């Protein structure tokens, strides 16, 4: 039986940069919500866009005071009693800032933690939500953190730098943390105690990976645009290559992230053409 290519289902954006409520400008991250809504860190509009409703809406006003956003890069939905959103952006000191917003966009608090003001600085290369509602971060030093935003507290952290060249995305499923390695063309897999388990993929299968997610059955999906077409490569939970899907309808480059929706639709963000793309289930 034949297997289909990737096919576009829906979009947010116009394939060109803009400042209007239907457009993005150099967007740098996104997340799924508990509904069909998708939130986008719309970097050069200094806002988070919420798409999904007939009329999109936005979180934040531009700036560096509490509740304002400045070059937001990542947005993470934390599952719990109610959904809350972490936004990572640039603070007034030019360094990483983390803020918490509630489900309808109101500012809650700035996340102030020792882990966010280290001497060495913190540049976040990947962020996701853990299954239990924690914020999962990977930094450019190779440190991996799981953060309870309420205490706030680092509940666990470890050093991935022996194996990890450069993180581009991260996902957690069960007790395992999967990090796409943009430098080594593979996925690095760890336990939450920091034990390295295995790598998945290789240059011939997962070149320059930019996104990862894990399906409800534990299959690992890894996205790249090497050669200027989106590819989604599927691995079994043990790392066996299953199938590589290609998007042939049009060219894409400089994509960021990957998420599987509950319905199976596949989501990535194209920074190059300022557009979020949703594809039919694989």
Instruction: Specify binding-site residues for Mg(2+).
Output: 169, 212, 258
Least distance from C-beta 91 to Mg ion, angstroms? 25
Q: Residue 115 in 3-state DSSP?
A: helix
Which of 134, 69, 67, 62 has its CA nearest to residue 106? 67
Piece in contact with Mg ion (CB under 5 A), picked from 13-21, 26-34, 49-57, 94-102: 13-21
With CB under 5 A as the contact rule, the residue among 48, 177, 252, 258 that binds Mg ion is 258
Under DSSP, the state recorded for 44 is G
Q: Residue 157 in 3-state DSSP?
A: strand
Least distance from C-beta 31 to Mg ion, angstroms? 9
What distance in Å separates the CA atoms of residue 37 and residue 258, rounded to the nearest whole number?
A: 15
# of chain residues touching Mg ion (CB under 5 A): 6
With CB under 5 A as the contact rule, the residue among 213, 232, 245, 247 that binds Mg ion is 213
Contacts of 34 (CB under 8 A, 6+ apart): 77, 79, 83
Contacts of 6 (CB under 8 A, 6+ apart): 230, 232, 245, 246, 247, 248, 249, 266, 279, 280, 282
Draw the binding track, 15-54, toward Mg ion (x: CB under 5 A; -: no contact): ---xx-----------------------------------
Draw the binding track, 110-149, toward Mg ion (x: CB under 5 A; -: no contact): ----------------------------------------
With CB under 5 A as the contact rule, the residue among 139, 169, 181, 224 that binds Mg ion is 169
Least distance from C-beta 19 to Mg ion, angstroms? 5
Q: Is 181 in the site for Mg ion (CB under 5 A)?
A: no
- For residue 189, CA distances in Å to 31, 154, 212 come to 22, 20, 12
Which residues are at the interface with Mg ion (CB under 5 A)? Answer: 18-19, 169, 213, 257-258
């Amino acid at each position: 039986p034949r297997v289909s290519d990737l096919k576009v289902h829906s979009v947010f954006g116009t394939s060109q940069q803009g400042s209007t409520i239907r457009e993005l400008h150099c967007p740098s991250g996104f997340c799924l919500s508990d509904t069909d809504d998708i939130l986008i860190a719309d970097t050069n509009n200094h806002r988070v866009v919420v798409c999904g409703p007939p009329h999109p809406w936005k979180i934040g006003r531009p700036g560096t005071d509490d509740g304002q956003l400045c070059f937001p890069r990542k947005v993470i939905a934390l599952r719990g009693e109610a959904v809350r959103y972490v936004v990572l952006d640039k603070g007034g000191d030019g360094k990483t800032r983390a803020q918490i917003f509630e489900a309808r966009g109101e500012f809650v608090k700035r996340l102030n933690m020792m882990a966010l003001v280290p001497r060495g600085g913190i540049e976040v290369s990947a962020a996701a939500a853990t299954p239990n509602g924690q914020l999962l971060l990977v930094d450019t030093a190779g440190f991996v953190y799981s953060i309870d935003v309420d205490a706030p507290r680092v509940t666990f952290w470890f050093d991935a730098s022996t194996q990890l060249g450069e993180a581009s995305d991260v996902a957690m499923f069960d007790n395992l943390i999967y990090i796409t390695d943009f430098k080594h063309h593979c996925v690095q897999v760890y336990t939450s105690e920091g034990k390295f388990i295995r790598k998945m993929g290789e240059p011939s299968q997962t070149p320059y990976p930019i996104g990862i997610d894990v399906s409800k059955a534990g299959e690992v999906l890894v996205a790249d645009t090497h050669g200027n077409h989106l590819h989604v490569v599927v691995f079994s939970p043990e790392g066996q290559h299953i199938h590589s899907f290609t998007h042939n309808e049009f060219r894409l480059s400089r994509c960021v992230g990957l998420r599987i929706a509950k319905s199976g639709h596949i989501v990535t963000l194209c920074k190059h053409n300022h557009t979020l793309f949703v594809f039919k289930p694989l």
